[model samples]
Target: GSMSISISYSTTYSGWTVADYLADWSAYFGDTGGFNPGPFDGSQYALQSTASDAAFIAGGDLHYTLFSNPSHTLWGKLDSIALGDTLTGGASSGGYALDSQEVSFSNLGLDSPIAQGRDGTVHKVVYGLMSGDSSALQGQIDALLKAVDPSLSINSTFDQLAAAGVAHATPA
Candidate 1:
């Protein structure tokens, strides 16, 4: 016999930050060892909540913008790979640095190798909703989480997010 599962949704955001965002994902889906040579290092980016705006911005050599969405949801342009020139002696040298790039979601049409390459389906899905409407984005998020839950080793992260009013799942 087969079992059926129902899904439900909720929203929450309490002092959310980029670190929290990544941690939530890692908690939900076991860490695949770190981003490695990526810009996701907690120190390199931050989520700033000021006034009525929430912004995710880079804090390192790479000048990239992630998002400034009004709903406190994380949505922005992300580059598969980011390249920057390394400066020496107050001048540009031949050395270069590579990292993930984050830009405004408005530039979603731009091609991203990371989003199209192998094992890029998740990134592609995320990119597709960065500039989408809230209801649609939430629906996609719910579906993605539900679809990946069975394969995940741990599934408590969603509960944590639900507690924080970020996202939650319920049986229908």
Candidate 2:
């Protein structure tokens, strides 16, 4: 089965515009010691890294966005209830959610951020990842998580994500 791993986060500032937020993230990720610099796939406001591609801006509220990468590599390695175990990031005051499932991409498209309307300088950083049968998508989420910590065990990490409320999906 294909699967999708959805890692979500949000950013906020007292007075920055969408473009500002994108720039901030872009810069942070661009910094020498920060996120790895990879190609920005035109859609999804994503700044790429070697193992993951993040859509810094999502269609959700509070500047909510998803950083997702799915694969079929972890198919049999995952537990039914520990689908959330595929994420590899530290917790934050901003809080986060990790969700994964046996599904495939149904649709993916991009548009301007509603918040960007306030400032035309803002990027059309809006994007989405829809999953259907691509149950194959979830396994790679395991790959993404594993890349960060080669020793990450789905059993322990998945349990932590569920209890942390970072993000979770019902077993399918």
Candidate 3:
């Protein structure tokens, strides 16, 4: 009943190597405020400030881009990891918008990485979403369906959705 979503995509531009982005990491996450961590699971891990590895990662300095939550509720090492979800053919998927990183809930204490997947090259951006509410997750689907079919009935929509799962049905 765990809820999670992993989306790793990137936009390719000119004049930089994937490694260049890796090296220039702070300019992006640091400038964009995209580093906003979360009250995700009520952990209050916010990285929307400071580019200091000393203030962030590993209770202080991984000596580079990795940052960890001060509350120690969530930990992640940026660019400190590699892509495994997308095949690199043993060569290298060498350039991406962002490097892949791992996020773990200290409360859950996952023994293995929460995400296990391939990396990408050329505009590589990997981010993940994990939440504890199934109804909220389904609500998003319901909203999307309403957008597509303005008259879609909520009760029947979810009922059919559940029935399909029960029937092991595939979308046609």
Q: Pick the candidate with the highest TM-score.
A: 1
Poorest stretch of ten by lDDT in candidate 3: 54-63
| Best model per lDDT | 1
| Candidate 2 lDDT by residue in tens digits, 18-87 | 2233333333323201111212221121222233322221211112222322211111111111111123
Give per-residue CA lDDT, model 3, range 62-153, as digits (tens). Answer: 11122342222232322222211111111122221112231111111112122322121100222221121123222333343344455442
Full-model lDDT, candidate 1: 0.27
Q: TM-score of model 3 relative to the true fold?
A: 0.20
TM-score for each candidate, following the candidate numbering = 0.22, 0.21, 0.20
For residue 148, give model 2's deviation from the true position in Å.
Answer: 2.2
* lDDT (Cα atoms) of all candidates against the true structure: 0.27, 0.25, 0.24
- Distance from true position, residue 141, model 2, in Å? 1.0
